[PDB]
Amino acid sequence: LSVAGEIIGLGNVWRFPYLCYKNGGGAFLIPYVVFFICCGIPVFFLETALGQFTSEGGITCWRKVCPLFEGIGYATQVIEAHLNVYYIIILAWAIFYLSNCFTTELPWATCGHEWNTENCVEFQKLQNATSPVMEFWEHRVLAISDGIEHIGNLRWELALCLLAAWTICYFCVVYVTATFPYIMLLILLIRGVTLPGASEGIKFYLYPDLSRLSDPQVWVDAGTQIFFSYAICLGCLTALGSYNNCYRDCIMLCCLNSGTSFVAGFAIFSVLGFMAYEQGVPIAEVAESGPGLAFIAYPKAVTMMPLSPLWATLFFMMLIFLGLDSQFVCVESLVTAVVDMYPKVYRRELLILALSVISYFLGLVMLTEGGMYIFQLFDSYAASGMCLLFVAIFECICIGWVYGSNRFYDNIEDMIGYRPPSLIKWCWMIMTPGICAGIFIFFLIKYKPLKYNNIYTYPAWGYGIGWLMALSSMLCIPLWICITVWKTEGTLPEKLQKLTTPST
Ligand SMILES: [Cl-]
Numbered sequence: 001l002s003v004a005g006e007i008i009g010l011g012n013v014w015r016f017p018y019l020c021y022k023n024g025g026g027a028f029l030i031p032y033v034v035f036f037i038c039c040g041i042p043v044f045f046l047e048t049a050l051g052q053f054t055s056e057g058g059i060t061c062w063r064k065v066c067p068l069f070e071g072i073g074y075a076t077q078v079i080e081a082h083l084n085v086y087y088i089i090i091l092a093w094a095i096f097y098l099s100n101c102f103t104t105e106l107p108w109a110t111c112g113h114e115w116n117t118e119n120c121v122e123f124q125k126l127q128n129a130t131s132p133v134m135e136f137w138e139h140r141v142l143a144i145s146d147g148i149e150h151i152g153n154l155r156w157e158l159a160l161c162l163l164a165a166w167t168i169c170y171f172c173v174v175y176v177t178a179t180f181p182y183i184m185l186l187i188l189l190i191r192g193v194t195l196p197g198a199s200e201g202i203k204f205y206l207y208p209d210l211s212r213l214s215d216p217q218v219w220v221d222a223g224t225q226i227f228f229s230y231a232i233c234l235g236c237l238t239a240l241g242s243y244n245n246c247y248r249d250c251i252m253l254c255c256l257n258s259g260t261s262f263v264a265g266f267a268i269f270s271v272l273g274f275m276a277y278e279q280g281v282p283i284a285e286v287a288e289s290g291p292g293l294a295f296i297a298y299p300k301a302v303t304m305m306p307l308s309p310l311w312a313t314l315f316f317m318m319l320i321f322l323g324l325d326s327q328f329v330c331v332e333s334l335v336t337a338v339v340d341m342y343p344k345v346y347r348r349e350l351l352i353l354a355l356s357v358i359s360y361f362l363g364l365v366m367l368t369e370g371g372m373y374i375f376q377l378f379d380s381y382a383a384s385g386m387c388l389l390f391v392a393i394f395e396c397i398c399i400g401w402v403y404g405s406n407r408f409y410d411n412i413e414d415m416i417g418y419r420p421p422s423l424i425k426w427c428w429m430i431m432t433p434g435i436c437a438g439i440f441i442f443f444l445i446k447y448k449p450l451k452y453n454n455i456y457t458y459p460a461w462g463y464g465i466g467w468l469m470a471l472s473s474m475l476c477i478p479l480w481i482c483i484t485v486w487k488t489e490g491t492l493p494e495k496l497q498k499l500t501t502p503s504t
Helices: 010-023 027-056 058-065 071-086 089-099 132-142 154-170 175-194 197-204 212-213 216-230 246-251 253-279 296-303 308-338 351-362 372-383 386-416 423-445 460-474 477-488 492-498
Strands: none
Touching: 010 216, 010 253, 010 296, 010 308, 027 058, 027 246, 027 253, 027 386, 027 423, 058 071, 058 386, 058 477, 071 308, 071 351, 071 372, 071 386, 071 460, 071 477, 089 132, 089 296, 089 308, 089 423, 132 296, 154 308, 154 351, 175 197, 175 253, 175 296, 175 492, 197 253, 212 216, 216 253, 216 386, 216 423, 246 253, 246 386, 296 308, 308 351, 372 460, 386 423, 386 460, 460 477
C-alpha cells in the first residue's frame, strides 16, 4: 500500500514542539539533522534487519547472535515498562480537555471565572498580564503547586479520566482512521500561517543561534528525540515480514517521520507569533517551556476559528486516537515478552489485568497537585536521556565488532538480493558509538542542574530519584555479564569462545 499509518504519534505532535521551544528554537535543528542521518537511519536499519533475520522476539534474538549481551534484551523491557506508566498521563489531560468542550463557549477562550485571577486580560477586545489560556492550563487543569516538596491533595476529576483511558484500552484499520490525523494537521497548519504576526514565529523557528550550541542539553535531547520518535530502544524487532525491501523502507518509512514532525512543529510556532504580537511580549517568554505547550498553542488556534466547538472536539479526538494506537502495542509487547516459560496456558487474561492495575496506581502519583514536577523527571531520565544513549552504544558494538559486520552484510545480501552501501557499516562500526559516547562524556563533564520551566530548581533528592530511574535500566547489561561469567563456564577462554559464537 502507500499509506502505512505507522508514521505519526504523540511523539511527533506533542513532544517535538515542546523540546524545540524549551531549548531556544532554531538552534535545536542542527543537532537534530546530525543525529537523523548518521545515528537515526543506520540503527533503525540494524534493528529491522536483525529482527527479521532471526524471525524472533528481542529477548531471545540477542541469545541467537550475542549470547554475552543479553542485557540489551532486558534493558528494553525496563524502558518500555517505564514508558507505559507516563505515556498514558497525556491521555488523562486530553480527555479532561474534551469533556469541557461540549458547550457553546469554550471555557479557556474568555476570562472572568473562578480559577482566573485579577490579571486576566482578553487581549482580543500591560504589566503583569496573563492570557486566559495559560490560566486555564495552570490553575484548574494542573493546579500547580510551589514545588515537588508539596505533593498536596489528589485531583479527583483527573483521577477518573485516567481510569477511562485504561478501561478503553483494556479492550483496545480503516483508511479514514489512518488519514484522519494528516487532514486535521493540514487544517491547523493553514489557520496558523494566515494569522498576522506569524512571520516572527517562523523566523524564530528557522534562524539558529550558534551561541547556545555549546550547551550540552541541546545535543542530549535532540538525538534522544530521534530515538524516542522512532521507537528504537523500546522494542522494534519484527519477526513478521517473510524473507524484502528492508533497505528501501528507511528511504521511505524511517525518514518521513521526521518530515511529519517538522511540518507539525511549523504549525505551532506560527500561533506563538500571534500571541507575542497581540500581547507585545518577546516570543521567548510568551508561553510555558514545560511539557504543557501543545495544550496552550493549539487551543488558541482552535478558538481563533469560526465554529470553535466543532473544531475543538475533533482535535482532542485526534490526540486520543494517536495515543491509543501507540500504547496498546507497547502494553501487548511487554506482556507477550514475559511469556517465555509458559507455565500454564486464564494466563492470557490474568497478566493483562495484573499489569494494568499496577500501572494505574503507579501512574496516579503524577495526577496530584505536584504531578507536573514528577512528570518532568519521568520525561528527562526514564525512557529518554542517558538510557537510550547507553543502550544504542552497546547494540552497535556487539553486531558491528563481536558478531562481525561483514558476516551480517552477507546475510542481508542473501535475504534481499544485494549488498547495501558500505556507508552503513562504517556508521555501525565508528560513527554511532563514537558520537553517542562523546555526547555522554560531554554531558557528564558539564553537568548543570535540570530546571522546570527555567524557573524551578529541583532539590537534591529529586535529582537522586531521576538518577535511580535511569540506573534501573542502565545497569541490566553489566550485571548480566557478571552473572553469566560467574555462573555456567567460569573462566579461561573457553567461556570467552562460548560467549561469542552465535546459536546454530
Ligand atoms: Cl521526530
